[PDB]
């Protein structure tokens, strides 16, 4: 019952924001962690009730507020590149189970112009695979996006599908040496040869992107990299 | 820390803490999403069970072991240890470094093959698909720029009770071909390389 | 309750000064408290500070929890204020009285509520500002409070002392006379 | 004129650890002003409403097995932990008393600077333990981890007699005697 708002965010160096955590379970204790790949889960601040907070493992750079029992707010006054991470909120009634929220990944970049939406291309099944295994695999390629804030899903005939789907765990860098490089992601949908050969079956790869928001100002000619869904689709063929 | 086992077998993972504790906990993180509590053992206890899990505690060595019996695909995750500190806040936990666990599927009828998928009207890239190999095969990262290779992932066709591995490789390169795409990676000689 | 020893965490929050207190008594003797302003643990005897430690957050946040419980209980009790319980004062010396031998005069204020007190020493009718010390607002089982006040003096047959105590349960300050 | 009590409300709590025969018992008290309305007793295992004021509080707390499980662990988590840690300087603190015999027809044996509180003060008249309807005051806490006691004795003297005050204390190998 732990909720985090926002879920994704991209900021310019020196900008400010506030992560909101909410729980409807009347829990007395709440926590704010940050998770980077090398160091694991580390505590920033915690609170055992309204009006009181306390420091944790990595407190410097973050402020916290507990004006209400349901909400635990985490604030960044001047964002820095070192604060690029995934921030997890948790609540508990003691030293037992901690109930974590979904997470919030935040990317701090020096220039907001490096924010690009993804290009989504679907690739129809290989004819050889259908003759050899009586199964058909579609591949989806989301390419050239920054930050790595994407949520890929497959839609068959307008309904989301999970059986036969396998998406990469996390996006990879198109250029691993260069910082602020753009990212790529792949996913596969495998259907029976009978299903793919039906010309009335519709396959669509959906990539929900998270970029700039309303309040962010865009002073460039290209379209504003707002949060959007980029899509690619393919129809079955009985050839 | 990393570890991989075959589906249906047992997995044992270890951790160690530094301070005096009142209780130890094990946490699991799938899909890089919210961590989930698994089991809690107190300092007075040595063994405790929960589902297919059995946690073991040793106060003298300040270590703990988690045992996953009859492992499933959903057990694939990172596993953390969480302890409090005697003399500190009873609700303040300290999480250790996690160990990654991968439960590989048991491929009944392996059929390793590399297919070239139909190029897209909207893309300048050509995609090859290395699929239907068994869990014994490891995909290696590409050593050539402009050629991108993803690690193996497992899909589950639940309707037909079928599981298969797959790895995707693509490149915007006219000399790039599926015959040399998964070079620099040890793949079976049995591999099927059909022409498009 | 059967007990060879009793260890108790006692704390309170209230509207007036002192607004909060968080202490720990061992067999009804205050072993340490958290200074809520300095945010420091203060040990009653220096020997305690060398063998034990206490994170001040244990007091500061516990006071915070109680302040929330205070505001909640104020609303539910329809703003019922408690009756003032007047204090009882007794004055006695720490050591047997000997003229010219340094001693300590103890003023024990007892059985008062709320824990809001002005206490002052009077020597020959005038104020004493040096050589004084005081304890915390100590808890009792009936949830009233008692307190100690100390004055280091040199006994003389020509000196008389007074412990002047002000409390809301008293319509006039209470003078407790003591002489050798 | 004045003497109108300012608006004041209080909340106070207790966390009591009762140690006996290697067993710890834990009581948590919630008190508004001087009214205890909610209590957790480890021997009971859950919260209990002491007053109608505390029925909603005790009902909600008993609903959360998380909270209940956290309070049931307190006897081993806090009571047993703090009891075994402080054993040296609190469970075994010894301070030798000082005895003084002087008259004011009563005879007063004054015992000062002793810890713990358990002490025996007996009166002797020419080697005979003539209690002689003795009147002793209650134990006097000085507030600085030392105790006092005064024992009166109705005496009618015969020149040449000797009254002996014997004091037995846990911090004394042999009884301390002082004669008049």
């Amino acid at each position: 019952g732990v909720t985090q708002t926002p879920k994704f965010r991209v900021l310019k160096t020196g900008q400010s924001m506030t992560l909101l955590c909410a729980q409807d379970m009347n829990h007395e204790y709440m926590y704010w962690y940050r998770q980077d790949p090398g160091m694991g889960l580390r505590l920033i601040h915690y609170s055992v009730g309204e009006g009181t907070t306390a420091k944790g493992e990595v407190p410097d750079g973050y402020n916290v507020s507990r004006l209400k029992k349901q909400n635990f707010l985490l604030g960044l006054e001047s964002a820095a590149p070192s604060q690029t991470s995934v921030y997890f909120c948790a609540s508990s009634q003691g030293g037992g189970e901690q109930y974590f929220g979904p997470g919030t990944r935040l990317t701090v970049t020096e220039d907001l112009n490096k924010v690009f939406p993804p290009e989504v291309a679907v690739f129809e099944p290989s004819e050889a695979e259908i003759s050899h295994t009586q199964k058909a695999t579609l591949v989806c390629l989301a390419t050239g996006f920054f930050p790595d804030h994407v949520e890929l899903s497959w839609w068959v005939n307008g309904k989301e599908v999970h059986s036969g789907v396998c998406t990469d765990p996390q996006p990879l860098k198109e250029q691993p040496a260069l910082n602020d490089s753009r990212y790529c992601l792949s996913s596969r949908l495998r259907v029976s040869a009978t299903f793919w050969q039906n010309p009335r079956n519709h396959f669509r790869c959906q990539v929900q992107f998270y970029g700039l928001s309303e309040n962010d100002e865009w002073t460039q000619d290209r379209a504003k990299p707002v949060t959007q869904i980029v899509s690619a689709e393919a129809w079955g063929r009985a050839d | 820390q990393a570890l991989s086992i075959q589906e249906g077998e047992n997995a044992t993972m270890n951790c160690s803490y530094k301070t005096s504790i009142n209780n130890l906990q094990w946490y699991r993180q799938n899909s890089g999403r919210g961590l989930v509590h698994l089991i809690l053992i107190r300092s007075n206890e040595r063994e405790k069970h929960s589902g297919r899990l059995r946690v073991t505690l040793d106060t003298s060595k300040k270590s703990s072991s988690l045992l996953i019996t009859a492992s499933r695909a959903a057990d694939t995750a990172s596993y953390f240890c969480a302890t409090d500190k005697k003399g500190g806040a009873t609700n303040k936990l300290i999480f250790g470094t996690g160990t990654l666990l991968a439960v590989q599927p048991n491929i009944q009828n392996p059929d390793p093959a590399v297919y070239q998928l139909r190029d897209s009207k909207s893309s300048d890239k050509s995609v090859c698909l290395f699929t239907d190999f068994d869990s014994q095969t490891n995909v290696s990262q590409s050593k050539d720029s402009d050629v991108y290779i993803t690690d193996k992932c497992v899909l589950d066709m639940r309707s037909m009770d079928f599981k298969s591995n797959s790895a995707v490789a693509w490149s915007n390169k006219s000399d790039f071909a599926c015959a040399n795409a998964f070079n620099n990676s040890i793949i079976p000689e049995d591999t099927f390389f059909p022409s498009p | 309750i059967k007990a060879d020893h009793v260890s108790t965490y006692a704390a309170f929050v209230q509207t007036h000064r002192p607004t909060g207190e968080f202490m720990f008594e061992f067999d009804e003797d205050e072993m340490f408290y958290v200074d809520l302003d300095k945010k420091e643990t203060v040990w009653h005897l220096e020997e305690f500070g060398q063998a034990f430690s206490f994170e001040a957050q244990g007091g500061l946040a516990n006071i915070a929890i109680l302040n929330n419980n205070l505001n909640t209980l104020i609303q539910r009790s329809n703003h019922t204020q408690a009756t003032n319980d007047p204090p009882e004062v007794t004055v006695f010396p720490k050591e047997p009285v000997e003229l010219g031998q340094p001693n300590t005069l103890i003023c024990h204020i007892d059985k008062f509520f709320p824990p809001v007190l002005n206490v002052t020493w009077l020597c020959n009718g005038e104020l004493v500002t040096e050589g004084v010390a005081e304890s915390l607002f100590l808890p009792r089982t009936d949830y009233s409070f008692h307190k100690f006040h100390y004055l280091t003096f040199v006994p003389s047959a020509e000196d008389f002392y007074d412990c002047r105590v002000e409390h809301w349960g008293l319509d006039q300050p209470l003078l407790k006379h003591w002489e050798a | 004129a004045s003497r109108a009590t300012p608006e004041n409300y209080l909340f106070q709590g207790r966390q009591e650890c009762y140690a006996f025969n290697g067993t710890q018992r834990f009581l948590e008290r919630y008190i508004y002003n001087r009214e205890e309305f909610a209590r957790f007793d480890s021997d009971v295992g859950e919260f209990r409403a002491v007053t109608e004021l505390g029925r909603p509080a005790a009902e909600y707390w008993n609903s959360q097995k998380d909270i209940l499980e956290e309070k049931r662990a307190v006897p081993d988590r806090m009571c047993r932990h703090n009891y075994e840690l402080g054993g040296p300087m609190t469970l075994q603190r010894r301070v030798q008393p000082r005895v003084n015999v002087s008259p004011s027809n009563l005879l007063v044996c004054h015992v000062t600077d002793f810890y713990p509180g358990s002490i025996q003060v007996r009166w002797f008249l020419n080697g005979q333990e003539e209690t002689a309807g003795v009147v002793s005051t209650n134990l006097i806490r000085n507030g600085d981890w030392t105790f006092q006691i005064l024992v009166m004795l109705e005496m009618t003297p015969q020149q040449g007699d000797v009254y002996t005050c014997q004091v037995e204390h846990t911090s004394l190998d042999s009884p301390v005697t002082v004669e008049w």
Partner: peptide, 14 residues
């Protein structure tokens, strides 16, 4: 110099 343990008081139902 070992550390003593404490316990959090609970918030009333409200």
């Amino acid at each position: 110099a070992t550390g003593l343990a404490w316990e959090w008081w609970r918030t009333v139902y409200e």
